[PDB]
Amino acid sequence: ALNLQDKQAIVAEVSEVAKGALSAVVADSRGVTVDKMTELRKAGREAGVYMRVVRNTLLRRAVEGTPFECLKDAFVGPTLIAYSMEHPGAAARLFKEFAKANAKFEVKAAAFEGELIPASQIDRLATLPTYEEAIARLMATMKEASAGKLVRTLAAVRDAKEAA
Amino acid sequence: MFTINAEVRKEQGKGASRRLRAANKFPAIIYGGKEAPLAIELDHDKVMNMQAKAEFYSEVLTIVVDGKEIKVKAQDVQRHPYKPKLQHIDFVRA
Amino acid sequence: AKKVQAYVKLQVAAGMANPSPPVGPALGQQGVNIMEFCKAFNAKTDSIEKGLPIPVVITVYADRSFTFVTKTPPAAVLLKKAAGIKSGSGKPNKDKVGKISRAQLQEIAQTKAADMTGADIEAMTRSIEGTARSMGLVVED
């Protein structure tokens, strides 16, 4: 009986950390070990990221009652959840940051605005620029569209005149 | 604190007191002011678990007798010599 | 293969490592001489106060070569140095020694901030106060 106020503290949190999060990552890990307890948890504090272990029996009532676009099947069994609440350009990277600092094969699913993004589709989203990178990518995108296409075309017609 | 339910004493004297305890009940009394004393009988194990609390003596409780509820405070207790089981208890009206 | 032990704990003073019983469980069982360790250790760990016992992890290989990595000195040794005491009380809470300021306790917390799991420097400052209790050191604002 997890709905009892003494046990309800983790029951009420799923509404914020799984549905209410800006980014989330879900993994089948039964416990975190000293290495991730010491470094990966502490590295997340500077990234706007946090993470926790969650029980299956809770999730059978919580992710089935909460509306989710395909994401709730990844909350069956044990769960390590990792998540972020702010700065989209840093928050969306959590799937790659997990795959770099931890065993990438333990991830069940990854999510943005609390909804599932497949591991084959999240690649660009988990590579997204931060605010100071995005204004440089905008200047670069304006350059690529205006001059880049034409200098790439000049180099291509040059290379086509080397060939025989 | 508590609320408990009891009957009026059916039979009194040296054998009837032990016959009541063989029936898994024990005797008690209620007195106070200028009103007459009332003798009662009640069950052991549920009242023993309440009587073990400080709240049975540090504050008032209610008792039901003959289908009517009255307010009381505990005064005294008697026990068996080998184990602390309630032999008899005294109440005063509150 | 490494064949011998890896990342075994030791604590030792840089350029002052003469006695052999306090290093034998880490170095002597793995065939490493305390002088041969110290001529490496005191050159790669020259910047610290040599009089303090530095916590280090050591590793030895199948060819009797070795490597080592340091931690910052113990919070109780930093507290002893900051309070100016000869020793902790040895009967803590019931008996107490010295004094340290909260401004110095935060500098010990900053000295351990690279070597603890903590999320905030005031919270880690209460962790150093928890060590000050265990050595019987008086702490005041």
Next chain:
Amino acid sequence: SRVAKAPVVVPAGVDVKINGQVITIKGKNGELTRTLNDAVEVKHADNTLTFGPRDGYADGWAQAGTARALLNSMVIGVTEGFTKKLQLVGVGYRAAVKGNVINLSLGFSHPVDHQLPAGITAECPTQTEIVLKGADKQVIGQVAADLRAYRRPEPYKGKGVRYADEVVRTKEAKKK
């Protein structure tokens, strides 16, 4: 207890039949076995067999728990068998096979003649290791135990027969 009233699942290529107080079972490896148990009533449907106690045996479903556990080991007996490997370590005492008889060094002047009954088959890649197959867990476990009756691992160097595993970590001689 909860399992004493639960079904035993019947594997692929296994066949089971019931006859009041008797279980009959067939397949591969052990190919055919049978047991009597008066203490239980038996039920069967396609891929499952179930037990429950008879009158005077009803206490804690204990004999139905025993019957569940027994037939759960018999389905493996008619599928692949038990006690798959046995070895020996020491100063030349040996563990090998010739026909159905164990080949070994004696220490004694006359042969100890440990041998395997019908329904058990064994082969050896070395004079220190034997691989074994059998129709049922008790009959192979009992003769594997008889081969270690006097040849069990000793308390100071651990030399002797091992069932591919051991419990003797050893100790040392008097007073240092």
Next chain:
Amino acid sequence: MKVRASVKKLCRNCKIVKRDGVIRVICSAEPKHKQRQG
């Protein structure tokens, strides 16, 4: 094997068992704790 009494749980590995209808001590870590008397 020892007699004594009270089937003493001399270590965590002392299981305490009923064998031949009598209470006994059995232990794999310390065979010295084999005892036949409650």
Next chain:
RNA sequence: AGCCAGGAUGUUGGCUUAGAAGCAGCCAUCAUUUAAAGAAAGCGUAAUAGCUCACUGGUCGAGUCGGCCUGCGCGGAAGAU
């Protein structure tokens, strides 16, 4: 209940100690991290270690845990025609 996976950090706290460790002894028994961990109940390594327990998660699918009041059993219970 079993089985399977995790079983933190300041920090080998202080004092002593051959030297000494969570675990040779005495004293503190705190704070942070944390799903979570006694400045460690028990095992255990030359010893720092390492492994269980404590503490957390899974697996699985109905009952289950310890004490209290109270009746009955067992062994404890060796002797001479």
